[PDB]
Design a protein around this ligand. Structure first.
Ligand code: ADN
Ligand code: K
Ligand code: K
Ligand code: K
Ligand code: MG
Length: 346
């Protein structure tokens, strides 16, 4: 019963991607009921950050996609530490009362920056989109003597009930990617989309990402994410989910608004790095474990044209409770870092 995270291995450019919700100290302390299982000393930022930095240093990924990156801590400690490791860092803070956000970092030696494309999901003119969540999309040029790579990162709305907002937020991210990744030959460049989607494998939202299609007629708003909730007394998704003045089509691309079928679509071909279930046993993988939750909500998606060489295996709920849950004295987030090795064949 050994508890280990192994590397599963499945004219080129090779690069590794890490997706990691590092847990904002402010979000930690605002929700202390989630960490009742934890010994008090392991929760302090002074304890947690060195461990998190050690992980990042150890894995030495070419691209970092981080969530719950607290602004004050980012400026003071996280960004300087990452810059020292040879990373160029781009940040997008949430737009509300919560001063955390997403960062996409990449090694100077591996890429040049073509464009930075932040996405704010908050729209003051649209009542539906009243949440502070954000995304970030970079276009990177691999440094070799080659096509660009589009890297996206997000942290979608947590609230389990509001699947209408989740899907609209996702649509806004997909729309940005569609714009940035478009090439002169009319196809999309290779895409890596990381983040905390607050949605479980096999959920409608997850299915939408994988299939590029969703029939959402008669679907309760709470069922979208597959997060734990009653589902009683929930309203059904509207057709359309979001209003025309968002300027995004049902194919999740920007469109020219004109002065004035319940199926969502996107034009990408996306695979998930992780299978979500252990092959031998069929036990589900988890990416987050605390007092109230043990689920997968973190993903690395990629265009399948990249080839996945390897991934760092996840753990079961039972495995994580053997080490008394997350965070603990050895692992300093309530999430596990996702890690993938990719190959771009030229
Ligand atoms: N919030 C929790 N959820 C699930 N299991 C827990 C929780 N807190 C402690 N445990 C574990 O459950 C068992 C309780 O005896 C122990 O193995 C302990 O680590
Ligand atoms: K929040
Ligand atoms: K409702
Ligand atoms: K235990
Ligand atoms: Mg969290």
């Amino acid at each position: 019963g050994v508890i280990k995270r192994n590397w599963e291995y499945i004219n080129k450019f090779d690069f590794s991607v890490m997706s990691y919700n590092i847990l904002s100290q402010d979000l930690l302390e605002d929700n202390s009921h989630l960490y009742r299982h934890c010994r008090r000393p392991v929760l302090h930022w002074s304890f947690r950050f060195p461990n998190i930095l050690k992980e990042i240093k150890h894995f030495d990924a070419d691209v970092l996609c981080l969530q719950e990156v607290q602004e004050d801590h980012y400026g003071a400690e996280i960004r300087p530490s990452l810059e020292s490791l040879g990373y160029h860092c781009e940040y997008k803070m949430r737009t509300g009362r919560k001063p955390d956000g997403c960062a996409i970092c990449f090694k100077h030696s591996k890429f040049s920056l073509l464009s930075v494309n932040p996405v704010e999901f908050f729209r003051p003119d649209i009542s539906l989109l009243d949440r502070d969540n954000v995304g970030l999309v970079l276009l990177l040029q691999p440094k070799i003597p080659c096509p660009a790579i589009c890297v996206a990162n997000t942290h979608l709305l947590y609230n389990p009930r509001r699947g209408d907002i989740k899907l609209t937020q996702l649509a806004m991210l997909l729309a940005e990617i569609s714009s940035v990744a478009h090439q002169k030959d009319g196809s999309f460049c290779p895409i890596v989309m990381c983040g905390d989607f607050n949605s479980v494998p096999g959920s409608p939202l997850y299915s939408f990402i994988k299939e590029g299609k969703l029939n959402y007629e008669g679907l309760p708003i709470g069922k979208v994410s597959g997060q734990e909730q009653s589902s009683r007394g929930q309203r059904i998704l509207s057709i359309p989910i979001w209003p025309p003045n968002l300027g995004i089509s049902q194919n999740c691309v920007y469109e020219v608004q004109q002065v004035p079928s319940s199926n969502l679509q996107h034009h990408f071909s996306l695979s998930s790095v992780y299978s979500h279930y252990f092959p031998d046993t069929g036990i589900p993988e988890v990416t987050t474990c605390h007092s109230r939750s043990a689920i997968t909500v973190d993903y690395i998606f990629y265009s399948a044209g990249l080839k996945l060489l390897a991934r760092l295996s996840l753990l079961t709920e039972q495995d994580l409770w053997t080490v008394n849950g997350l965070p603990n004295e050895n692992n300093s987030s309530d999430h596990l870092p996702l890690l993938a090795k990719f190959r771009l064949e030229l």
